[PDB]
Ligand SMILES: Cc1cc2nc3c(=O)[nH]c(=O)nc-3n(C[C@H](O)[C@H](O)[C@H](O)COP(=O)(O)OP(=O)(O)OC[C@H]3O[C@@H](n4cnc5c(N)ncnc54)[C@H](O)[C@@H]3O)c2cc1C
């Protein structure tokens with residue numbers, strides 16, 4: 529039932545591609561499609577952008593593309609805009625299974641006057657709105673790919689991977705999970721446990737929910753899926769249900785998975801990390817263990833993968 533992908537030679541590279549294109553001479557790619565991923569009650573629009581790179585900017589799952597929006601640097605006249613990085617939300621074969629496209633998961637950065645609620649498009653985010661405003665056939669200046677922290681360790685195809693995302697931080701995990709469960713990749717037959725924790729504002733802010741729910745039904749012994757809907761659910765203390773609260777629910781089980789060698793990944797808002805770290809520390813110290821030492825050991829054993837901003 530897995531999807532045929534091509535071309536298999538994307539499996540042959542021994543090292544991840546890195547900085548194939550640089551800001552000084554970006555690759556001119558072409559938009560294939562842009563679609564909203566969210567419902568009307570979502571607090572902002574998050575869009576899914578499919579980009580045709582023609583096979584010229586291949587990548588591994590977990591990497592990022594840079595995008596240079598058009599225009600001049602506002603704080604450097606005569607100069608191009610700075611690169612904005614976006615975690616790639618597709619597998620190396622991309623959403624058309626042909627190794628020609630990659631996808632981004634982009635939240636429109638929109639400014640509202642805090643008192644009047646008044647929108648002001650002059651203060652909106654340049655690149656995020658450029659991308660979600662794009663249309664088929666538009667050109668995109670691409671750099672990269674970049675990133676090694678979030679590469680998926682594939683040495684053990686029965687490994688455990690605990691994936692913790694807030695909002696568009698889900699992007700790399702869509703790529704991981706498609707590779708683990710959707711695509712017919714003969715050199716990676718995942719037989720382990722993948723456990724996605726996703727925190728979003730409300731049910732309408734869910735990103736790729738139908739896809740992840742399909743893995744639940746198709747691979748119930750290998751995929752688990754927990755959601756923290758911050759504006760629809762309350763945690764034990766009556767505060768907003770964030771991912772660190774959902775982790776807390778399973779904290780015993782997670783710590784045991786981590787002691788057995790599981791990988792844990794964090795992507796999204798940097799603000800979630802103190803709360804997550806506080807949750808795991810409580811479990812360690814419950815057990816009589818120094819969290820500082822355990823975290824240092826997790827990093828030395830390459831189990832601890834953080835890319836937040
Ligand atoms: C490794 C990495 C991966 C990333 N992955 C993703 C991803 O997958 N998806 C994603 O959506 N983002 C991601 N980001 C963030 C992304 O790189 C951009 O920073 C983000 O999209 C906003 O950039 P922008 O060009 O839209 O906004 P910018 O134009 O850079 O503006 C920055 C912010 O300032 C605000 N602003 C501008 N002028 C004013 C003003 N005068 N007063 C008040 N506010 C103002 C804008 O509204 C915006 O919120 C990632 C970041 C990193 C480092």
Ligand SMILES: NC(=O)c1ccc[n+]([C@@H]2O[C@H](COP(=O)([O-])OP(=O)(O)OC[C@H]3O[C@@H](n4cnc5c(N)ncnc54)[C@H](OP(=O)(O)O)[C@@H]3O)[C@@H](O)[C@H]2O)c1
Nearest residue numbers: 615694695696697727728729758770796797799800835836
């Ligand atoms: N590789 C990377 O570095 C990477 C990749 C993708 C995205 N990002 C970054 O990740 C962020 C994604 O944000 P978004 O705009 O898509 O999401 P968002 O809607 O701003 O937030 C996502 C969810 O996280 C919750 N949240 C807010 N503060 C939190 C905290 N301190 N701890 C835990 N949860 C918290 C939000 O709840 P409330 O809004 O109800 O408070 C919401 O439910 C962006 O800043 C983006 O630039 C980075």
Ligand SMILES: [Mg+2]
Nearest residue numbers: 566567732734
């Ligand atoms: Mg929806």
